[PDB]
Design a protein around this ligand. Structure first.
Ligand SMILES: Cn1cccc(O)c1=O
Lengths: 164, 164
């Protein structure tokens, strides 16, 4: 079996769901594992869906760019919903080489080693309302390469400073 | 015929060329058309390669995010190499919905309707030296979808203010 790819856009073009709806649906349908790599994560609806997946028992591994991590922390604080308390969620940070902060410029969502959303959509209010973006929904062989990249990234990630 | 995808990383993992080398090689080998969509374009080596392609006769269409366009203009000025003077290069800008500037969060390189580099690598010094990133090299059927998205984006692009 090979690889299948569909494209989604924001604003939508020739597909019924928005990218955000698609992200929420993928997370709702997760059975076992969610692996998320994200540059900036402030979107509350998407966060809620991930918390809720973790309460059904899904293992959630999140890797965030270190330089923007505080924005996710502020968002969890405001929602009164500390990620440290949630037993099925792990959050670690990734950084690039400094000079000026080097960043992890990577994002993707990998659900049940089965389906990947890969593209330019960051999990922020502004990608729902303001920005033009595109993603791929990937299934098949190429998903195993995203799995391997996730593990590679995870190996180079750090416990965030705040956590103890 | 279907679609073929290879992944490249920065830093490199199990491939001989860096992403920047790959970008320069794709542009050097262009025979007819380069279509580029880019959020920020300040890298001088990559610019030089595109200018040089255009002097061999390759048609170059570039679409840049409007809010960062000034960074590309500054770079061309500094290189004493005005894009308005170069007859085989067209540059237009794209923006999102404002509230706060909505942005075109899209980037990709499409050469000869034949090969696409699609991923998180922006054409800046910092992606060569500092940031972690990944791209896909795509050939086959899916390339026709990037072609169609390029034309769609081009249709919604504006002549930059500076140009007259
Ligand atoms: C991950 N990714 C993929 C394509 C384009 C992007 O700007 C990006 O961040």
């Amino acid at each position: 079996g090979g690889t299948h790819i569909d494209l989604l856009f924001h604003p939508p073009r020739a597909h019924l769901l928005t990218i955000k709806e698609t992200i929420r649906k993928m997370i709702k349908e997760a059975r076992k594992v969610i692996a998320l790599v994200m540059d900036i994560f402030t979107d509350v609806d998407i966060f809620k869906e991930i918390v809720e997946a973790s309460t059904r028992g899904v293992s959630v591994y999140i890797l965030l760019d270190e330089s923007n991590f505080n924005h996710f922390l502020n968002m969890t604080e405001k929602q009164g919903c500390s990620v440290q308390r949630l037993r099925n969620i792990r959050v670690r940070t990734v950084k690039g080489q400094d000079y000026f902060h080097g960043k992890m410029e990577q994002k993707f969502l990998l659900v049940d080693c089965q389906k990947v959303m890969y593209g330019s959509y960051s999990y922020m209010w502004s990608f729902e309302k303001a920005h033009l973006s595109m993603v791929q929904i990937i299934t098949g062989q190429l998903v195993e390469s995203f799995d391997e990249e996730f593990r590679t990234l995870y190996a180079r990630s750090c416990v965030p400073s705040s956590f103890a």
